[PDB]
Design a protein around this ligand. Structure first.
Ligand SMILES: Nc1ncnc2c1ncn2[C@@H]1O[C@H](COP(=O)(O)OP(=O)(O)O)[C@@H](O)[C@H]1O
Ligand SMILES: Nc1ncnc2c1ncn2[C@@H]1O[C@H](COP(=O)(O)OP(=O)(O)O)[C@@H](O)[C@H]1O
Ligand SMILES: [Mg+2]
Ligand SMILES: [Mg+2]
Lengths: 56, 371, 371, 56
């Protein structure tokens, strides 16, 4: 019974830790998505300036 | 009250209240019924997604444009598009607003009469007026003369105007436009291995055409350069990955405008139908038309067309005349801006086709004095 | 009244009233006649022990599953199983309860028609409805899109769905499942000396597979490690003592899923039939299917499969798309939870096949509008 | 004994999941760092262009 309690406690902590890690990776994935949007927008604006200048 | 300046177009419906700078709501004019079976219950699946909603669910729809070449081929779908435009994109009931539709030149009468009959019976507007799509584009430029080449997505037409007096015998309407360029691009992409067939993938090819294609200043030199170096190959990422590389398909797609023999059309390019339209005019207004050539419509947004066209016309025209091509940056919405200006005029306020007039003469009122 | 959400399955029958979280009674679907003679008189020996009773007397029985691969091969035994399920595990007479069976995709028609004929004639239910086992597993995840890989014990099928519209041309049904993995494990255990032959000992090998086997993240590295160290050898105590030690048989049994050439099957693994099922879909819904890959069914409970499958698909798929594999902890009962949710819906309440409808059109009603 | 075996298996599963999640988050952080490096490089090039345009 004592060993079962110990193992259950460690497994519960492991579940909590993996939940925290999954939330953290969600946050960082969202941040990378935002920065990818930033690069898309800046490249699009540079292309717009290029086409405006080449087309007067 | 304020007037509704709608502009059916063919490919993008542009609408908004009169007196502004830009249309309030711009969205593709496609109505797509779902084609698969559907197993989830209670998902709230509608029977037809119209407008910009069907450009997001296009993976399981069969989009079909209700306007083929200026003319309207499927009246129920067009009615659905108008109903959406009035109620969901502008949220103004049509019972309290005049409308100003636009129509290409030389279109069938029945199309215009059915349009006015719908607007007066179904939507029950107070008064509607139909205007030629080129006069508005001439309004927006702030000119009063000039020959305007309005290369839309359905049909390209070239209306010359002098001192406000339109020349009805010199209108040259050609049915090559953006849609045929999309189909030709989709047909020449197959030379590298990329096959687009579904009506949904036509939208992807349209996006490729918009973002990559450009008009070459000199065609043979570009064909020779693209066949030796590799400085032209621009890549593009499909909606799922697998980037593609477009080589000399870049300037071969929009070259069809100046050589309609590519898609098998007999007629001459947009560089020579303008000169022919000028030469049909009288001998004393040709200088002014030469100096005030106006471009409009979406398809004239290709990077480098305002120079190719000027070079071609200068080659054709006499050496003394000055050739100038007006290409405003707001080309796409030029027709709608002109429509707003025309609807905002006080002198124009008595030209609307009032409903009592329609009740007395029937739908054939549009061909009468109220043009 | 309440509906009975039965789920025949192949290996475990799961049943319970609609609207709960977990099935009320879960028990193996085996019917085993005794095989020896029997000398005690008056012991009350029955002629066939079904369900969980035959997993305790399995020492003197010959268990035989009535469902081979989704399809039902022995109708009398299946009728016996259903009778047991209704009367002894739930204790509710079927005369007062609608039923919602489940069926694998692409199964023979005669199986489904016989199922409905039995339910309407023998048990005499008020109304029954048959649903595809993958749509329910998609219900349980609370999604409305996604491609679900439901690797049961009989048959593994992979149904892609978008926005509630199932794609019937992209269903890839493969007949490798948990039973073949049990047989292959029983066949490779003989390489150490342990021979299991009797149909009762197949249950022991199944228990070994459930408790010890796991899916390797990388197969060759694990094969090399297990051949040098001894950190993998896990021991297990048979039902009579004589512990056994499983070496590299641990991750070789479930590896058959990703390399069906081990048991001589030609087809590609579950890692590549999902990618093929995606690629048959339209080009515009592939991103959503990539991001919402759903796992279900019992056999997808191996420790470490949600990472191996993601690694494999990421290797196959284009580098830009994000690959996400939904593996809920309640995987085993996912189909039944989805069945309960579907039966609890108000919109679904008029889709049942009412008995008067069956009386008018015969058993072939199931293929008709009431699917 | 059954409970102890269940707990041990849960613990092993959670530990392996946490290892995979940690490796994945580190890799995604590396990718974000690389894209930020590209953005900074082109931004410095544009800043040099602006420095020259100050003379324009
Ligand atoms: N930026 C662009 N570059 C190249 N082609 C474009 C661009 N924008 C629009 N087009 C083409 O023009 C069409 C839209 O033309 P539009 O003026 O909206 O037609 P309409 O006269 O019916 O409103 C699109 O189908 C597209 O093919
Ligand atoms: N915890 C587990 N680990 C590994 N395999 C399992 C586990 N539980 C069940 N299985 C396998 O899955 C099968 C049960 O699958 P199930 O989903 O009940 O099939 P069905 O779709 O017929 O209900 C069993 O035969 C067993 O081989
Ligand atoms: Mg137009
Ligand atoms: Mg199942």
């Amino acid at each position: 019974s004592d060993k079962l309690k110990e193992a259950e406690t460690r497994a519960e902590f492991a579940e909590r830790s993996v939940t925290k890690l999954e939330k953290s990776i969600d946050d960082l994935e969202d941040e990378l998505y935002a920065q990818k949007l930033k690069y898309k927008a800046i490249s699009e604006e540079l292309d717009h300036a290029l086409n405006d200048m080449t087309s007067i | 009250t304020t007037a509704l300046v709608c502009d059916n177009g063919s490919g993008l419906v542009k609408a908004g209240f009169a007196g502004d700078d830009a249309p309030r709501a711009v969205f593709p004019s496609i109505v797509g019924r779902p084609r698969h079976q559907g197993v989830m219950v209670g998902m709230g699946q509608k029977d037809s997604y119209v407008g910009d909603e069907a450009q997001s669910k296009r993976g399981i729809l069969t989009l079909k444009y209700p306007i083929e070449h200026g003319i309207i081929t499927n009246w129920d779908d067009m009615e659905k598009i108008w109903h959406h435009t009035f109620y969901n994109e502008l949220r103004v009931a049509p019972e309290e607003h005049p409308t100003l539709l636009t129509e290409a030149p030389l279109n069938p009468k029945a199309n215009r009469e059915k349009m006015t009959q719908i607007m007066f019976e179904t939507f029950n507007v107070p008064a509607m007026y139909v205007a030629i799509q080129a006069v508005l584009s001439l309004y927006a430029s702030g000119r009063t003369t000039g020959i305007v080449l309005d290369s839309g997505d359905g049909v390209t037409h070239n209306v010359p105007i002098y001192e406000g007096y339109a020349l009805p015998h010199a209108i040259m309407r050609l049915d090559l436009a953006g849609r045929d360029l999309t189909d030709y691009l989709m047909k020449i992409l197959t030379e590298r291995g990329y096959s687009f067939v579904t009506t949904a993938e036509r939208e992807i090819v349209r996006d490729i055409k918009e973002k990559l294609c450009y008009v070459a200043l000199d065609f043979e030199n570009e064909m020779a350069t693209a066949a030796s170096s590799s400085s032209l190959e621009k890549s593009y990422e499909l909606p799922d990955g697998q980037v593609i590389t477009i080589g000399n398909e870049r300037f071969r797609c929009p070259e069809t405008l100046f050589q309609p023999s590519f898609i098998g059309m007999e007629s001459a390019g947009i560089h020579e139908t303008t000169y022919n339209s000028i030469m049909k005019c009288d001998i004393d207004i040709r200088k002014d038309l030469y100096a005030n050539n106006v471009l409009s419509g979406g398809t004239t947004m290709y990077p480098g067309i305002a120079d190719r066209m000027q070079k071609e016309i200068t080659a054709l025209a006499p050496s003394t005349m000055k050739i100038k091509i007006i290409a405003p940056p707001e080309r796409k919405y030029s027709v709608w801006i002109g429509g707003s200006i025309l609807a905002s005029l006080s002198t124009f306020q008595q030209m609307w086709i009032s409903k009592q007039e329609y009740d007395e003469a029937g739908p054939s009122i549009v061909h009468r004095k109220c043009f």
